[PDB]
Enzyme design. Structure first.
Site, PDB file in Angstrom:
ATOM      1  N   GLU A 261      -4.107 -10.522  -0.367  1.00  0.00           N
ATOM      2  CA  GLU A 261      -5.053 -10.496   0.719  1.00  0.00           C
ATOM      3  C   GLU A 261      -6.415 -10.839   0.159  1.00  0.00           C
ATOM      4  O   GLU A 261      -6.792 -10.324  -0.905  1.00  0.00           O
ATOM      5  CB  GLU A 261      -5.237  -9.065   1.261  1.00  0.00           C
ATOM      6  CG  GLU A 261      -4.041  -8.567   2.063  1.00  0.00           C
ATOM      7  CD  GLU A 261      -4.001  -7.040   2.171  1.00  0.00           C
ATOM      8  OE1 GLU A 261      -3.252  -6.362   1.483  1.00  0.00           O
ATOM      9  OE2 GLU A 261      -4.747  -6.538   3.142  1.00  0.00           O
TER      10      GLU A 261
ATOM     11  N   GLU B 114       0.785  -1.207   0.000  1.00  0.00           N
ATOM     12  CA  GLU B 114       0.000   0.000   0.000  1.00  0.00           C
ATOM     13  C   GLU B 114       0.828   1.272   0.000  1.00  0.00           C
ATOM     14  O   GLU B 114       0.838   2.009   0.983  1.00  0.00           O
ATOM     15  CB  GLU B 114      -0.909  -0.137   1.239  1.00  0.00           C
ATOM     16  CG  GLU B 114      -1.917  -1.302   0.982  1.00  0.00           C
ATOM     17  CD  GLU B 114      -2.915  -1.438   2.057  1.00  0.00           C
ATOM     18  OE1 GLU B 114      -2.565  -1.407   3.217  1.00  0.00           O
ATOM     19  OE2 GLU B 114      -4.126  -1.695   1.642  1.00  0.00           O
TER      20      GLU B 114
HETATM   21  C1  LIG Z   1      -4.705  -5.120   3.414  1.00  0.00           C
HETATM   22  O1  LIG Z   1      -5.765  -4.528   4.082  1.00  0.00           O
HETATM   23  C2  LIG Z   1      -5.916  -5.083   5.403  1.00  0.00           C
HETATM   24  C3  LIG Z   1      -7.261  -4.613   5.958  1.00  0.00           C
HETATM   25  O2  LIG Z   1      -7.376  -5.064   7.309  1.00  0.00           O
HETATM   26  C4  LIG Z   1      -4.739  -4.634   6.267  1.00  0.00           C
HETATM   27  O3  LIG Z   1      -4.831  -3.245   6.558  1.00  0.00           O
HETATM   28  C5  LIG Z   1      -3.448  -4.909   5.489  1.00  0.00           C
HETATM   29  O4  LIG Z   1      -2.397  -4.322   6.213  1.00  0.00           O
HETATM   30  C6  LIG Z   1      -3.522  -4.447   4.024  1.00  0.00           C
HETATM   31  F1  LIG Z   1      -2.396  -4.839   3.271  1.00  0.00           F
HETATM   32 MG   LIG Z   2      -2.373  -0.226   4.923  1.00  0.00          MG
END
Ligand SMILES: *[C@H]1O[C@H](CO)[C@H](O)[C@H](O)[C@H]1F
Ligand SMILES: [Mg+2]
Ligand SMILES: *[C@H]1O[C@H](CO)[C@H](O)[C@H](O)[C@H]1F
Ligand SMILES: [Mg+2]
Ligand SMILES: [Mg+2]
Ligand SMILES: [Mg+2]
Ligand code: NA
Ligand code: NA
Ligand code: NA
Ligand code: NA
Ligand code: NA
Lengths: 1011, 204, 193
Positions: free
Chosen positions: B127, B51
């Site tokens: 994820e 991110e």
């Molecule tokens: C993907 O999103 C999730 C949401 O809970 C977490 O914030 C992770 O760190 C992110 F990579």
């Molecule tokens: Mg994040």
């Protein structure tokens, strides 16, 4: 904190890089590019003091001026002022290899400038100082307060002084370090100097400002339509009423425009750049930029309120052009370039590394006038104005990062080390951010001779990512690595493979077709113009013209890196490595240019001009076919001049207008030519002349030429019958020949013509004798030191074979009396250490007509190295003002470097017959001569010769041209045969086999007589 | 193995990662991880971080790895999950069949994603299946898809263990605490508990 | 130098990274993976003291223990010992966004260790200290002597102390910054410690 010993620290408080700015506060001024009240030069007289080290610098200096400081000009290189010596080292670092450490003894130049600033500046907005070039690292203080630090000697370092300044008088203090960790990245083959060598200035920007802008041009399939995209970034409070207006002008005509509020498009989950905006402007039938037609537009970027109030304007010239590699070819505006390039350092014999417009302009014009269309920034980003000039006059530019680590072991020691990635990246990134809007810059380069490291790969991808508009090249590690879009070798030969390990240099023609290979090939360096060089140049051109993916190269290089010095009586002379006590040094190896440091040309320039001609000719009967190698312009300022001569005597001539479309053809048929019945060779010569002047040339300028032999009528007529018959008088020691006022004398012990007299005037100072050696060319020497000998270099080979020391051994000497003449027959053996190197067999035949006809047949041992020349030489008593000849000229020409020369009747002052190469060697040769006249003498036959006030021996013993002294009389070198001079490189034998005197048996003959 | 780089809070997300001035800091975060972990057989893929939008820094670092260690594929989801800085299409939360056509960085249905014109990469979700609280509904749907499409090669659920912290009451009894429980604010409250197991490793 | 507010400085004097070493002087032990005499742990009880800003730290600390410090376990996260509060933010940074700047009030953990070293170490070879993880940036001193600086909360930071160590008793002083220009690259959805 020794920041100058921390590649982790390359700056402190430095501002972000950007394209050239002026903060104009009037759009009109920006458009016209008039000077900006917001941009002030602080160039001029400054205070300077030198120290052996930074620890030697006095704290006081920061608050106040040193009484001991002097007043000097800025910009300048302190070595040019005499503070310390400039050092000329090639590969070997001028300091001990111990990265990131530098010597304790580190020359420090303390600069300071007392100046004023008006409240105006101070009351609102931003006041920043810009150091265009500081060598190699430096700290800056303002009014006694430290401001920051900077590295990278070749890019502007910028600092905000807004909060340091006070109305009125201010004082700058610059502590400049000769060496630093940035030096490990500045190992270029050039003089090692230092100082504030480029402009210093002050720029005022408003608080809400244009902090950056990128200009791009994209085209349609046929370029008949374009889109100009301008990305503009701001610093300042973000406000709704803010706008950007980007307007495009063609001269005084505004062709397009767009205005918009900030706030770029969405780019990711968090949004877009609110501080940015992109203007897209449609341009129909744009006038395209190229080196052939440098068309430009003016882009004006205004930052202003919605409602009209202009905050500031920045601007640039724009060249609409597309650079792209497709299917293995580098295309410009969709057409394949054929690069007529040259490498060019920023060098000045008086000023060192300080660059002025005058000089720049001058370099540009000579280059253009000599058929060059491109230049490479070897090996660092150049002074800003350079790009502007290239944009305007029209030259393709390779912009190169200041990264050269040649002295390392192995070469990629640093570039392959992640710990050096940061310092390296900045050398790349800041260049790009600075020069990305110049249309002249068509390719980016990652630096030079730094091996191939992971760092290059990273950096290469970075660029491709940020600016897809331009190809990226790099030669390090093999020239065809994954870090380069072009196969860009240095010194690969045309036909000859040089299979070095890990980094072979394949024949350029073979390189292209290696399995899986598809890239274009453009040599980053080729044809080392060191001294009497450029032999084999045409060979490259022919290949460039036959193979589509061979798109040329950049000659090495533009100008000799010689520095002017003064003798005891204040007379100036050209200096090279070691001439300043500098050691270790690499002597004359800093002198490899096509022109002398003062910009006077070396003879090679012409060879380059010819081979790089833009018009190609073929002859068929009386029809000349002209072919145009222009990609974009028609021959609209060109005329063809032709002329026919018989042995120098002009018979006919005419002029024809050229009307050739680019890449086009034009057939020109000549009028029946007058018929001479008179014996000899008819020659046709054609020249393309530019009727009108241009910004880079005078009317009448000659851009291209070619010559051909037309008919020949063999003389079958018999010479006229001689009244006299010469007399021979013998003695044990001589044979003397007498005919009227003339006499010849031949020594029986030595077997040579030892004296000749006209009337009672002796004509020789030294007997006529055979010659098989030459005062070695730089190319003949290669590296070959005396501490360090290279046995494979020509000189070394000749030296070891005893060529320079063999002694003539008379085998025979006799005299016979003919019907109408006397005949002298000789034979000599040249030996060394019991080895017979050469055999010379001659006959001298003097008739009642006073003509001495010399016939020479020589044998060369097959196992001795091929000799430099096969001729005769002697010192003439006489000194005449001119030399007139019927052969190739008018300039110096060698066997492998004679295409440019023309056959005709030449007549120059004796002095033009000598080439004042700074490092002295055989020079002044003229080939294909049928007739040579000097004083009352005249020689006939088919040979090459040289003539000057300097013997080969002197030439060979003196290392600086200024040290030469005219000898009594004139030395004549007449050769039946002369070895090529070479130059594919200047450090290994480079003479192609066809130009080596390896036939084993040689024959020639000359007629010596009077007039 | 993932570099320590996340610039989530920037606006836009690639504000730093696309700026050359931040290349150096970023570089070390990747280079140093590689120099350390490169001999580990378990590590089969390198990640450029998380991110941080997609910046030119990413591309250069991507290339630095490829060059230095060709033994492992490099992935990065930032900026769209299928940029030029990733060898694997690695989105976070793309659904099985439902497309979520967000501007600039849409999350296509994973099955549709694979077949976008010119797309050839494998797709593994960085994820998927946010196990926050009473969740994991529709898990099976992913599995059925992973099983039927060759290029759908799995994913990494988000995530393993609840990030709750132990707090003690007055009577010194413990209890699981989350965002805001420490006087911390601003905070994201229960958002830190997305695990398949409780902090003490008891399964959900 | 506010090195923690300059992304241009992410370390000073840090050694190069590399794979996990143990410097075994016996092949069999390396093979079998036995513990190695050349590699020693400093984990255990250290001394600690909390300050609100790097400027609140007193110089005494460099030369000598701070009576006020406590004996704490190392490794650890100071928010877990109650010195200050852990923060749970997802996207929004826990600090004001203004790179490369950090808050003036920036929690500082002053850590210290008094220890001895084998003489032989002193004698020959190189002795370096290795910190597996320090969040988020830190300055290191040995026997009063400033050794170096390090950033990146998730990789080991290594320094040569060959020249700072001394016969018997040595003292390490680690000044750890909660916030740094490193924080801008550490915005992960998790507790901020
Ligand atoms: C993907 O999103 C999730 C949401 O809970 C977490 O914030 C992770 O760190 C992110 F990579
Ligand atoms: Mg994040
Ligand atoms: C190519 O070699 C020439 C040889 O004189 C110079 O050394 C250049 O810098 C190098 F790039
Ligand atoms: Mg430095
Ligand atoms: Mg070099
Ligand atoms: Mg920092
Ligand atoms: Na070609
Ligand atoms: Na050179
Ligand atoms: Na000489
Ligand atoms: Na599958
Ligand atoms: Na979460």
């Amino acid at each position: 904190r020794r920041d100058w010993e921390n590649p982790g620290v390359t700056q402190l408080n430095r501002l972000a890089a950007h394209p050239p700015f002026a903060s104009w506060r009037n759009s009109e001024e920006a458009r016209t590019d008039r000077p900006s009240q917001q941009l002030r030069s602080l160039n001029g007289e400054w205070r300077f003091a030198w120290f052996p080290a930074p620890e030697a610098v006095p704290e006081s200096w920061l608050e106040c001026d040193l009484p001991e400081a002097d007043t000097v000009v800025v910009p300048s290189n302190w070595q040019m002022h005499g503070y310390d010596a400039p050092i000329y080292t090639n590969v070997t670092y001028p300091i001990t290899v111990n990265p990131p450490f530098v010597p304790t003894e580190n020359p420090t130049g303390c600069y300071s400038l007392t100046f004023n600033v008006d409240e105006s500046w101070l009351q609102e907005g931003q006041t920043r100082i810009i150091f265009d070039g500081v060598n190699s690292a430096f700290h800056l203080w303002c009014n006694g307060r430290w401001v920051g630090y900077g590295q990278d000697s070749r890019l502007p370092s910028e600092f905000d002084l807004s909060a340091f300044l006070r109305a009125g008088e201010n004082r700058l203090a610059v502590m400049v370090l000769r060496w630093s960790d940035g030096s490990y990245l500045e190992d270029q083959d050039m003089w090692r100097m230092s100082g504030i060598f480029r402009d210093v200035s002050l720029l005022h920007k408003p608080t809400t400002q244009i902090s950056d802008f990128h200009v791009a041009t994209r085209f349609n399939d046929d370029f008949s339509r374009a889109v100009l995209e301008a990305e503009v970034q701001m610093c300042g409070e973000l406000r709704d009423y803010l706008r950007v207006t980007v307007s495009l002008w063609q001269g005084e005509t505004q062709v397009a425009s767009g205005t918009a509020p900030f706030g770029g498009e969405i780019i990711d989950e968090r949004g877009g750049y609110a501080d940015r905006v992109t203007l897209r402007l449609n341009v129909e039938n744009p006038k395209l930029w190229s080196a052939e037609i440098p068309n430009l537009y003016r882009a004006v970027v205004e930052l202003h309120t919605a409602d009209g109030t202009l905050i500031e304007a920045e601007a640039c010239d724009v060249g609409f052009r597309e650079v792209r590699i497709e299917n293995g070819l580098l295309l410009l505006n969709g057409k394949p370039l054929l690069i007529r390039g040259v490498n060019r350092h920023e060098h000045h014999p008086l000023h060192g590394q300080v660059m002025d417009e005058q000089t720049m302009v001058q370099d540009i014009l000579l280059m253009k006038q000599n058929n060059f269309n491109a230049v490479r920034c070897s090996h660092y980003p150049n002074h800003p104005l350079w790009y502007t000039l290239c944009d305007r006059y029209g030259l393709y530019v390779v912009d190169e990062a200041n990264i050269e680590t040649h002295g390392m072991v192995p070469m990629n020691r640093l570039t392959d080390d992640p710990r050096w990635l940061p310092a390296m990246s900045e050398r790349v990134t800041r260049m790009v951010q600075r020069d990305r809007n110049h249309p002249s810059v068509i390719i980016w380069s990652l630096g030079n001779e730094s091996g191939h490291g992971a760092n290059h790969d990273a950096l290469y991808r970075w660029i491709k990512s940020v600016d897809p508009s331009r190809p990226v090249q790099y030669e390090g590690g093999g020239a065809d690595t994954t870090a380069t879009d072009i196969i860009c070798p240095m010194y690969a030969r045309v036909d000859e493979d040089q299979p070095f390990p890990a980094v072979p240099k394949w024949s350029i023609k073979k390189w292209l077709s290696l399995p899986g290979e598809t890239r274009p090939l453009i040599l980053c360096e080729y044809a080392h113009a060191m001294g009497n060089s450029l032999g084999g140049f045409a060979k490259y051109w022919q290949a460039f013209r036959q193979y589509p993916r061979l798109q040329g190269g950049f000659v090495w290089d533009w100008v000799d890196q010689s520095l002017i010095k003064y003798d005891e009586n204040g007379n100036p002379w050209s200096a090279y490595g070691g001439d300043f006590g500098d050691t270790p040094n690499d002597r004359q190896f800093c002198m490899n240019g096509l022109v002398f440091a003062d910009r006077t040309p070396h003879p090679a320039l012409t060879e380059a001009k010819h081979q790089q001609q833009f018009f190609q000719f073929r002859l068929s009967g009386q029809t000349i076919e002209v072919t145009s190698e222009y990609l974009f312009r028609h021959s609209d300022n060109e005329l063809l001049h032709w002329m026919v001569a018989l042995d120098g005597k002009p018979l006919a001539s005419g002029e024809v207008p050229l009307d050739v479309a680019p890449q086009g053809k034009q057939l020109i048929e000549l009028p029946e030519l007058p018929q001479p019945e008179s014996a000899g060779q008819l020659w046709l010569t054609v020249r393309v002349v530019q009727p009108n002047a241009t910004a880079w040339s005078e009317a009448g300028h000659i851009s291209a030429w070619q010559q051909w032999r037309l008919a020949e009528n063999l003389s079958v007529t018999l010479p006229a019958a001689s009244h006299a018959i010469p007399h021979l008088t013998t003695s044990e020691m001589d044979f003397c020949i007498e005919l009227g006022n003339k006499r010849w004398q031949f020594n029986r012990q030595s077997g040579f013509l030892s004296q000749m007299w006209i009337g009672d005037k002796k004509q020789l100072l030294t007997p006529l004798r055979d010659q098989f050696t030459r005062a070695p060319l730089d190319n003949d020497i290669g590296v070959s030191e005396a501490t360090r000998i290279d046995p494979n270099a020509w000189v070394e080979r000749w030296k070891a074979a005893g060529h320079y020391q063999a002694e003539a051994a008379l085998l025979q000497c006799t005299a016979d009396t003919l019907a109408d003449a006397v005949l002298i027959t000789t034979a000599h053996a040249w030996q060394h250490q019991g080895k017979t190197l050469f055999i010379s067999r001659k006959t001298y035949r003097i008739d009642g007509s006073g003509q001495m006809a010399i016939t020479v047949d020589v044998e060369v041992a097959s196992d001795t190295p091929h000799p430099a020349r096969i001729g005769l030489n002697c010192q003439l008593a006489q000194v005449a003002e001119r030399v007139n000849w019927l052969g190739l000229g008018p300039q110096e020409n060698y066997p492998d470097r004679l295409t440019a020369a023309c056959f005709d009747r030449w007549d120059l002052p004796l002095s033009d017959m000598y080439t004042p190469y700074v490092f002295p060697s055989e020079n002044g040769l003229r080939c294909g001569t049928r007739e040579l006249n000097y004083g009352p003498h005249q020689w006939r036959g088919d040979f090459q010769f040289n003539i000057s006030r300097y013997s080969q021996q002197q030439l060979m013993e003196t290392s600086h041209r200024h040290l030469l002294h005219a000898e009594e009389g004139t030395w004549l070198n007449i050769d039946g045969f002369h070895m090529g001079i070479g130059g594919d490189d200047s450090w290994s034998p480079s003479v192609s086999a066809e130009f080596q005197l390896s036939a084993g048996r040689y024959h020639y003959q000359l007629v010596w007589c009077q007039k």
